[PDB]
């Protein structure tokens, strides 16, 4: 089993909404995937409360409930945590049962530091007990063409960024809002980028 984190105390950094949709990306590919809630206002929780998720969704009440990650969940191909909204506890826990931690972070110059603040955090651990770490742009708007201060930002940290941004897009609003992920809607642009992400997020564990 291998456990992915999405972490990042900036609140609305986008790790729910990518939580969700390379969650269900990954299980229409056929692996068996559950998915952490270790957020305190439990978006993901609640948004499963529709019952329509492709995988399993569990709800962390403390640092404990992701420690037993790896026992509890160990029969599935993928675990993936959702982030909470602040550098406490419950996200050192997280990074410290990880295999990979994502880092969704937005073309904001202004909010990049949060962003900072968790390669701060696993830049702490020995080489010899380092944790894969990637970057994932999130929200990032149509007429983008060329983000050069976002790539220097990322460039200075060390940490790599995936290729495929997840762009701003309203059916990752309405989605969400219904309960379901834009591989129901009928966007097919937002169900492509998310396909190829996760491409690329299988190939760092192939
Ligand atoms: N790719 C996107 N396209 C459009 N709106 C987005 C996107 N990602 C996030 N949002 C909007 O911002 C909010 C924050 O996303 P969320 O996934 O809850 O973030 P975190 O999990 O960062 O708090 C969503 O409820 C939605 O309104
Ligand atoms: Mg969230």
Request: proline content about 5%; charged content about 25%.
């Given at each position: 089993m291998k456990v992915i984190s999405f972490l990042?105390?900036?609140?609305?950094?986008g790790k729910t909404t990518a939580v969700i949709n390379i969650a269900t990306a990954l299980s229409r590919s056929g692996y068996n995937i559950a998915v952490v809630d270790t957020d305190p206002q439990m978006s993901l929780t609640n948004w499963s409360k529709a019952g329509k998720a492709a995988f399993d969704v569990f709800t962390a009440a403390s640092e404990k409930d992701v420690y037993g990650i790896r026992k509890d969940l160990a029969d599935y191909d993928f675990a993936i945590v959702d982030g909470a909204g602040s550098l406490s506890v419950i996200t050192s826990a997280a990074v410290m049962v990880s295999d990979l931690v994502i880092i969704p972070v937005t073309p904001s110059p202004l909010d990049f530091s949060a962003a900072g603040s968790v390669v701060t955090v696993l830049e702490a651990q020995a080489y010899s007990r380092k944790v894969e770490a990637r970057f994932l742009i999130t929200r990032?708007?149509?007429?983008?063409?060329?983000?050069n201060v976002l790539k220097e930002s990322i460039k200075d940290t060390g940490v790599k960024a995936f290729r495929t941004a997840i762009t701003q897009r309203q059916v990752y609003v309405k989605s969400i809002l219904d309960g379901?992920?834009?591989?129901?809607?009928?966007?097919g642009a937002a169900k492509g980028e998310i396909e190829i992400l996760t491409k690329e997020i299988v190939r760092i564990f192939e």
């Open positions: 990042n105390p900036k609140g609305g950094s990032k708007i149509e007429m983008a063409t060329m983000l379901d992920s834009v591989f129901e809607s009928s966007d």
